[PDB]
């Protein structure tokens, strides 16, 4: 009947309006086979450095306080940082540089005018182009 024909037309229109949407979404996700394919895996690369950053900072403050400025463990730290440098370790927050919020985890503000780091309590660390942990800097 006329009502049955109208209902059938509505169903056909709905299915047609869904088919092209699901096809377009399928194509968009197919594009992801090369865009974020290495990003999700390289999150593991980010993690295998986010875990070691604590030990890196511990060695850093060991050298800073002179308890490990030299010695076999200082050589161990040197070997570690030299090996990781190939992966793209570019320490940021160097002393005397501009305070970058996206790069520096500023905690203590000893002086309230270009912001600048008073001291790197913890040296920031990097893995290629992925900002891992903002540098713990005392903005002065």
């Amino acid at each position: 009947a006329a009502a049955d024909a109208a209902h059938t037309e509505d169903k056909v229109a709905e299915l047609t309006a869904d088919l092209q949407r699901v096809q377009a979404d399928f194509a968009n996700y197919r594009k992801r086979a090369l865009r974020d394919q290495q990003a999700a895996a390289d999150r593991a690369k980010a993690s295998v450095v986010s875990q070691l950053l604590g030990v890196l900072d511990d060695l850093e403050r060991a050298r800073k306080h002179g308890d490990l400025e030299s010695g076999p463990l200082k050589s161990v730290a040197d070997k570690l940082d030299s090996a990781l440098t190939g992966l793209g370790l570019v320490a940021f927050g160097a002393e005397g540089e501009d305070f970058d919020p996206v790069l520096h985890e500023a905690v203590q503000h000893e002086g309230d005018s270009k912001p600048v780091i008073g001291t790197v309590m913890r040296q920031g660390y990097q893995l290629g182009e992925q900002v891992l942990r903002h540098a713990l800097v005392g903005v002065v």
Binding site: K31, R43, A62, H65
Partner: protein
């Protein structure tokens, strides 16, 4: 297109809809939870997340930390401005999430559901909606966190009775909802100054007191040591939902001899110092029970919502407030709300139900190959109405006919798998192995009816089978195949046969 956003006083998770499923979009710097410290810059460049928080520990007064703690009330500041409006601060993290949804492949995320705590108000809903529309993101559902979590875990029916225990992290919320033909909530109440941050501050204070006991250092002005202690405490708290014996040791706190702080913080002490915070839960639960007609067994299901609910004390309290009933599992508690918001966004604009996704999984579909081995064509959970292809070849020289058998059962050994049928194709001219190509397709429709057809690409010989035995299996036995397949995980014997195929060529 649909986006699931869980705005929060401490965290915020965003999750967009990839067809019929939600996925929690990671933020710019890899993480999923954007720390909702919407802090303005030194000059103009508004930051959200950790890029804003790192500028807040130094600059306390250039930052709005929590906004979900204030609805309608002007928790507003000014930064080179003049009385910046309050909800726009959360609209800023909403805009950040809208932009960051493009981290996963998207074009224009213009539909989203924002979530609000159970403790609600017309003012609160209006403020969240105004923030959403200011952020440039059309919103139609402002679902309460309880019902959003319930939808995330899946409750869309008898007369369900869903309980919610939103630990939150900074705010608390408990409620019992009876899910019927409509979304129903009775009465909500809970702590507003209580959350996991209080557990973190409690362990921080315990460590400070222990170090003051072991040495005279104040540990209240060594800001670097304060950050070290706070990070250590948070790490220990998250790790305390495992390995009940725990300890931490910060190397260098402060020296004149480098002092070596070291405490073996035990979850026993965690409860001993957090029992007041835990017992602060009793009043809201009794209140929500007594507000309406409720019995201890009247609760059907309970869901753990909010970050850091994995603490054993909270699970014990929930299972001692109703009984030995276990809660629901599957979605991470810090992101259950965003998943629910995304699912509701899909439902509202017509992206689920229909005839789509009613098909779920035709268990197993495959064809047994030479050597007691089966070649999978349709993956285990692949949506039922699929289509596939495979070019097979005769296993022997001058083979007149090839018989192919379809088997179900994910086990690589087809002897233990169930026999469904056998179809043999004849008319193959005598030819050496390698050149022939036999095309095999699995054609399956919505109802679950399977079609397996083999056609000769070289000549044109075609035979068909209509096993149709994929459907009709009892649902109870389906779950047994999961255990049967998972028990023999270390099953790599098929590589031996694959190597033995070296005879060809």
């Amino acid at each position: 297109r649909a986006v699931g956003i869980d705005l929060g006083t401490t965290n915020s998770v965003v999750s967009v809809l990839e067809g019929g499923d939600p996925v929690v979009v990671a933020n710019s710097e890899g993480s999923r939870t954007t720390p909702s410290i919407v802090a303005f810059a030194r000059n103009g460049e508004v930051l959200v997340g950790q890029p804003a928080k790192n500028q807040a520990v130094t600059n306390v007064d250039r930052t709005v930390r929590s906004v979900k703690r204030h609805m309608g009330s002007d928790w507003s500041i000014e930064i080179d401005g003049k009385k910046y409006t309050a909800p726009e601060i959360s609209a800023r993290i909403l805009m950040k999430l809208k932009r960051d949804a493009e981290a996963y492949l998207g074009e224009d995320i213009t539909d989203a559901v924002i979530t609000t705590p159970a403790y609600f108000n017309d003012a609160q809903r209006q403020a969240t909606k105004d923030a959403g529309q200011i952020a440039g993101l059309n919103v139609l559902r402002i679902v309460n966190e309880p019902t959003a979590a319930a939808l995330a875990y899946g409750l869309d029916k008898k007369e369900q009775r869903i309980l919610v225990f939103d630990l939150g992290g900074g705010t608390f919320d408990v409620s019992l909802l009876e899910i019927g033909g409509v979304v129903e909530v009775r009465a909500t109440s809970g702590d507003n100054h209580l959350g996991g941050d209080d557990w973190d501050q409690r362990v921080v204070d315990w460590l400070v007191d222990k170090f003051k006991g072991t040495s005279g250092i104040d540990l209240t002005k060594d800001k670097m040591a304060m950050q070290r202690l706070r990070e250590a405490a948070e790490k220990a708290k998250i790790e305390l939902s495992s390995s009940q014996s725990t300890s931490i040791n910060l190397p260098y706190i402060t020296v004149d001899n480098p002092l070596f702080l070291d405490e073996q913080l035990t979850r026993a002490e965690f409860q001993r110092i957090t029992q007041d915070l835990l017992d602060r839960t009793r009043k809201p639960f009794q209140s929500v029970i007594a507000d309406t007609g409720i019995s201890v067994s009247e609760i059907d299901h309970v869901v753990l919502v909010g970050g850091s609910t994995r603490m054993p004390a909270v699970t014990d309290l929930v299972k001692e407030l109703t009984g030995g009933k276990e809660p629901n599992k599957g979605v991470n508690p810090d992101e259950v709300v965003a998943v629910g918001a995304a699912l509701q966004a899909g439902v509202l604009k017509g992206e689920v139900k229909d005839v789509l996704l009613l098909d779920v999984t035709p268990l197993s579909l495959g064809i047994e190959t030479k050597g007691g081995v089966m070649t999978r064509l349709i993956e285990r959970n692949t949506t039922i109405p699929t289509k596939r292809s495979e070019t097979f070849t005769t296993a022997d020289d001058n083979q007149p006919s090839v018989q192919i058998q379809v088997y179900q059962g994910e086990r690589e050994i087809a002897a233990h798998n169930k026999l469904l049928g056998s179809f043999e194709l004849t008319g193959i001219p005598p030819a050496p192995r390698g050149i022939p190509q036999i095309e095999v397709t699995f054609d399956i429709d919505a109802n679950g009816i399977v079609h397996v057809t083999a056609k000769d690409k070289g000549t044109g010989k075609e035979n068909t089978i209509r096993i149709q035995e994929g459907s009709g299996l009892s649902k109870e036995d389906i779950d047994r195949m999961i255990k049967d397949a998972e028990a023999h995980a270390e099953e790599d014997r098929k590589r031996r046969e694959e190597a033995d195929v070296r005879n060809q060529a």
